[PDB]
Enzyme design. Structure first.
Site, PDB file in Angstrom:
ATOM      1  N   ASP A 180       0.837  -1.188   0.000  1.00 26.02           N
ATOM      2  CA  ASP A 180       0.000   0.000   0.000  1.00 26.02           C
ATOM      3  C   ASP A 180       0.879   1.248   0.000  1.00 26.02           C
ATOM      4  O   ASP A 180       0.561   2.243  -0.654  1.00 26.02           O
ATOM      5  CB  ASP A 180      -0.920  -0.015   1.226  1.00 26.02           C
ATOM      6  CG  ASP A 180      -1.879  -1.207   1.224  1.00 26.02           C
ATOM      7  OD1 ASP A 180      -2.699  -1.315   0.287  1.00 26.02           O
ATOM      8  OD2 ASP A 180      -1.812  -2.038   2.156  1.00 26.02           O
ATOM      9  N   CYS A 214       0.798   0.690 -14.345  1.00 32.14           N
ATOM     10  CA  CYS A 214       0.407   0.697 -12.944  1.00 32.14           C
ATOM     11  C   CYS A 214      -0.758   1.690 -12.984  1.00 32.14           C
ATOM     12  O   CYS A 214      -1.771   1.405 -13.620  1.00 32.14           O
ATOM     13  CB  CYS A 214       1.556   1.170 -12.036  1.00 32.14           C
ATOM     14  SG  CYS A 214       2.629   2.462 -12.700  1.00 32.14           S
ATOM     15  N   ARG A 220       5.987   2.529 -10.671  1.00 32.35           N
ATOM     16  CA  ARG A 220       6.219   1.099 -10.566  1.00 32.35           C
ATOM     17  C   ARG A 220       6.633   0.564 -11.935  1.00 32.35           C
ATOM     18  O   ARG A 220       7.521  -0.273 -12.032  1.00 32.35           O
ATOM     19  CB  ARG A 220       4.955   0.379 -10.086  1.00 32.35           C
ATOM     20  CG  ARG A 220       4.386   0.908  -8.777  1.00 32.35           C
ATOM     21  CD  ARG A 220       3.174   0.103  -8.312  1.00 32.35           C
ATOM     22  NE  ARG A 220       2.457   0.809  -7.253  1.00 32.35           N
ATOM     23  CZ  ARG A 220       1.288   0.432  -6.743  1.00 32.35           C
ATOM     24  NH1 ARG A 220       0.674  -0.663  -7.179  1.00 32.35           N
ATOM     25  NH2 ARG A 220       0.718   1.171  -5.806  1.00 32.35           N
ATOM     26  N   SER A 221       5.983   1.052 -12.984  1.00 33.73           N
ATOM     27  CA  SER A 221       6.297   0.623 -14.337  1.00 33.73           C
ATOM     28  C   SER A 221       7.767   0.914 -14.613  1.00 33.73           C
ATOM     29  O   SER A 221       8.467   0.124 -15.257  1.00 33.73           O
ATOM     30  CB  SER A 221       5.422   1.368 -15.346  1.00 33.73           C
ATOM     31  OG  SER A 221       4.068   0.960 -15.259  1.00 33.73           O
ATOM     32  N   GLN A 261       9.336   7.445  -9.547  1.00 27.82           N
ATOM     33  CA  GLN A 261       8.837   8.623  -8.836  1.00 27.82           C
ATOM     34  C   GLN A 261       9.356   8.949  -7.438  1.00 27.82           C
ATOM     35  O   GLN A 261       9.140  10.054  -6.944  1.00 27.82           O
ATOM     36  CB  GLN A 261       7.306   8.570  -8.803  1.00 27.82           C
ATOM     37  CG  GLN A 261       6.661   9.056 -10.082  1.00 27.82           C
ATOM     38  CD  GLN A 261       6.821  10.553 -10.260  1.00 27.82           C
ATOM     39  OE1 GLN A 261       6.202  11.342  -9.544  1.00 27.82           O
ATOM     40  NE2 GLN A 261       7.665  10.953 -11.203  1.00 27.82           N
TER      41      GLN A 261
HETATM   42  C1  LIG Z   1       5.277  13.270 -13.871  1.00 32.58           C
HETATM   43  C2  LIG Z   1       5.225  14.220 -12.671  1.00 32.58           C
HETATM   44  C3  LIG Z   1       4.493  13.616 -11.459  1.00 32.58           C
HETATM   45  C4  LIG Z   1       3.919  14.702 -10.527  1.00 32.58           C
HETATM   46  C5  LIG Z   1       3.193  14.107  -9.307  1.00 32.58           C
HETATM   47  N1  LIG Z   1       1.866  13.589  -9.644  1.00 32.58           N
HETATM   48  C6  LIG Z   1       1.231  12.557  -9.028  1.00 32.58           C
HETATM   49  O1  LIG Z   1       1.738  11.940  -8.092  1.00 32.58           O
HETATM   50  C7  LIG Z   1      -0.179  12.122  -9.512  1.00 32.58           C
HETATM   51  C8  LIG Z   1      -0.158  10.958 -10.556  1.00 32.58           C
HETATM   52  C9  LIG Z   1       0.572   9.729 -10.023  1.00 32.58           C
HETATM   53  C10 LIG Z   1       1.912   9.517 -10.458  1.00 32.58           C
HETATM   54  C11 LIG Z   1       2.662   8.420 -10.010  1.00 32.58           C
HETATM   55  C12 LIG Z   1       2.122   7.449  -9.091  1.00 32.58           C
HETATM   56  N2  LIG Z   1       2.975   6.382  -8.703  1.00 32.58           N
HETATM   57  C13 LIG Z   1       3.229   5.323  -9.621  1.00 32.58           C
HETATM   58  O2  LIG Z   1       3.997   4.400  -9.366  1.00 32.58           O
HETATM   59  C14 LIG Z   1       2.540   5.261 -11.018  1.00 32.58           C
HETATM   60  O3  LIG Z   1       1.250   4.852 -11.058  1.00 32.58           O
HETATM   61  O4  LIG Z   1       3.130   5.588 -12.005  1.00 32.58           O
HETATM   62  C15 LIG Z   1       3.610   6.432  -7.391  1.00 32.58           C
HETATM   63  C16 LIG Z   1       4.296   7.655  -7.049  1.00 32.58           C
HETATM   64  C17 LIG Z   1       4.946   7.845  -5.814  1.00 32.58           C
HETATM   65  C18 LIG Z   1       4.945   6.826  -4.854  1.00 32.58           C
HETATM   66  C19 LIG Z   1       4.294   5.614  -5.131  1.00 32.58           C
HETATM   67  C20 LIG Z   1       3.621   5.372  -6.368  1.00 32.58           C
HETATM   68  C21 LIG Z   1       2.985   4.029  -6.488  1.00 32.58           C
HETATM   69  O5  LIG Z   1       1.916   3.854  -6.979  1.00 32.58           O
HETATM   70  O6  LIG Z   1       3.705   2.991  -6.007  1.00 32.58           O
HETATM   71  C22 LIG Z   1       0.753   7.627  -8.626  1.00 32.58           C
HETATM   72  C23 LIG Z   1       0.156   6.692  -7.707  1.00 32.58           C
HETATM   73  C24 LIG Z   1      -1.180   6.870  -7.253  1.00 32.58           C
HETATM   74  C25 LIG Z   1      -1.949   7.980  -7.701  1.00 32.58           C
HETATM   75  C26 LIG Z   1      -1.386   8.918  -8.603  1.00 32.58           C
HETATM   76  C27 LIG Z   1      -0.029   8.772  -9.090  1.00 32.58           C
HETATM   77  N3  LIG Z   1      -0.911  13.254 -10.093  1.00 32.58           N
HETATM   78  C28 LIG Z   1      -2.092  13.658  -9.578  1.00 32.58           C
HETATM   79  C29 LIG Z   1      -2.708  14.837 -10.313  1.00 32.58           C
HETATM   80  O7  LIG Z   1      -2.652  13.151  -8.611  1.00 32.58           O
END
Ligand SMILES: CCCCCNC(=O)[C@H](Cc1ccc(N(C(=O)C(=O)O)c2ccccc2C(=O)O)c2ccccc12)NC(C)=O
EC number: 3.1.3.48
Length: 282
Positions: A180, A214, A220-221, A261
Site C-alpha cells: 500500500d 500501474c 512502478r512501471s 517517482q
Molecule cells: C510526472 C510528474 C508527477 C507529478 C506528481 N503527480 C502525481 O503523483 C499524480 C499521478 C501519479 C503519479 C505516479 C504514481 N505512482 C506510480 O507508481 C505510477 O502509477 O506511475 C507512485 C508515485 C509515488 C509513490 C508511489 C507510487 C505508487 O503507486 O507505487 C501515482 C500513484 C497513485 C496515484 C497517482 C499517481 N498526479 C495527480 C494529479 O494526482
C-alpha cells in the site's frame, strides 16, 4: 561499479539527493497532442502525459490518441510500451493498442483499487463465461484461464478482432502484492515476476513491445523496465558492473516523463538489479 555505489549511497542517506539529481537532469519534451482539449478525458492525470515524439498512435483516423509511450532502448535492444492504467472510456483504445502493436504480454503492477479509490479500470474479464466486447474498437476479450500465486497472477486471455475474426493469445502478468505504501521490503518476488514475464517470450523480438502499466505508468512501471534493461545490459557487456543504472534511467526518461517517482523506487531498482544479477549466475 554499482555494487559499491549502492554501498556509498545507501549508508549515506544520499538516495533522496541522487533521485533529485536525476529529476533535475531528466529530459523535457513537448506533450502537445496529450494536452489538446479533446483528449482531456483520455488522460487519468493532468500532470502525466506522453511526449509527442514517442507517443503511441492508435491506427484509427478519428483520434489516434492514447496515454502511452514507446520506450526504445537501443543498446539493450528491448522495447516497452509504458501506459497509464486505462480509464472506463479508454479500455477499447487500450486493447486496440495491444492489437495494433502486436503485443504478446501485458504487465500490471497495481490493483484495481488501492487506498480506497480506483487506480485502474477493470479492463479484463474476471470470469471465463463473461467475456468483454469493446464496441468502439470492435474487439472481444475472453478469459481462458489464470494461475493465481502468492505474489502475482498470470492470465491467459484471448483477444479477437471482430472485424477480421482473427484471434491472438495475450498473457496478463499481474503483480498483485505491491504494498500500500513504499516499496516491497525484498525484490525477490518482483524478480520472480520479471523472470516469469521473460520466460513467456513476451519481452522478445518476435513480438511487439510488452505493455506495462500501474496507475500513471511511470513509477512502478519504471522500476520494472529499468530493472529488466539493466539486467539485460549486464548480459551483453564484457564488464557487467559498468552498467550505470542512473544513466539508464536518464535514457529511459527521454521517452516518458517521471519514470521512477521516489527515492524508494530508485533504491528498490538498484536492489532488484543487483540481486537479479546474482541469482542469474548463482
Ligand atoms: C510526472 C510528474 C508527477 C507529478 C506528481 N503527480 C502525481 O503523483 C499524480 C499521478 C501519479 C503519479 C505516479 C504514481 N505512482 C506510480 O507508481 C505510477 O502509477 O506511475 C507512485 C508515485 C509515488 C509513490 C508511489 C507510487 C505508487 O503507486 O507505487 C501515482 C500513484 C497513485 C496515484 C497517482 C499517481 N498526479 C495527480 C494529479 O494526482
Amino acid at each position: 561499479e554499482m555494487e559499491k555505489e549502492f554501498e556509498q549511497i545507501d549508508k549515506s542517506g544520499s538516495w533522496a539527493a541522487i533521485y533529485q539529481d536525476i529529476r533535475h537532469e531528466a529530459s523535457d519534451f513537448p506533450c502537445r497532442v496529450a494536452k489538446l482539449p479533446k483528449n482531456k478525458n483520455r488522460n487519468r492525470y493532468r500532470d502525466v502525459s506522453p511526449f509527442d515524439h514517442s507517443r503511441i498512435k492508435l491506427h484509427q483516423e478519428d483520434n489516434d490518441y492514447i496515454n502511452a509511450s514507446l520506450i526504445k532502448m537501443e543498446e539493450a535492444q528491448r522495447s516497452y510500451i509504458l501506459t497509464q492504467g486505462p480509464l472506463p472510456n479508454t479500455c477499447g483504445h487500450f486493447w486496440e493498442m495491444v492489437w495494433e502493436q502486436k503485443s504478446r504480454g501485458v504487465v500490471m503492477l497495481n490493483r484495481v483499487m488501492e487506498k480506497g479509490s480506483l487506480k485502474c479500470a477493470q479492463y479484463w474479464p474476471q470470469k471465463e463465461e463473461k467475456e468483454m466486447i469493446f464496441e468502439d474498437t470492435n474487439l472481444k476479450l475472453t478469459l481462458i484461464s489464470e494461475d493465481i500465486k502468492s505474489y502475482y497472477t498470470v492470465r491467459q486471455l484471448e483477444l479477437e478482432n471482430l472485424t477480421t475474426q482473427e484471434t491472438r493469445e495475450i498473457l496478463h502478468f499481474h503483480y498483485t502484492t505491491w504494498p500500500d505504501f513504499g516499496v516491497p521490503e525484498s525484490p525477490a518476488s518482483f524478480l520472480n515476476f520479471l523472470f516469469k514475464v521473460r520466460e513467456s517470450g513476451s519481452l522478445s523480438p518476435e513480438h511487439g513491445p510488452v505493455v506495462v502499466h500501474c496507475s500513471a505508468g511511470i513509477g512502478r512501471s519504471g522500476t520494472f523496465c529499468l530493472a529488466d534493461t539493466c539486467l539485460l545490459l549486464m548480459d551483453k557487456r564484457k564488464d557487467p558492473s559498468s552498467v550505470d543504472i542512473k544513466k539508464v534511467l536518464l535514457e529511459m526518461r527521454k521517452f516518458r516523463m517521471g519514470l521512477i517517482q521516489t527515492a524508494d523506487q530508485l533504491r528498490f531498482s538498484y536492489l532488484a538489479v543487483i540481486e537479479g544479477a546474482k541469482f542469474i549466475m548463482g
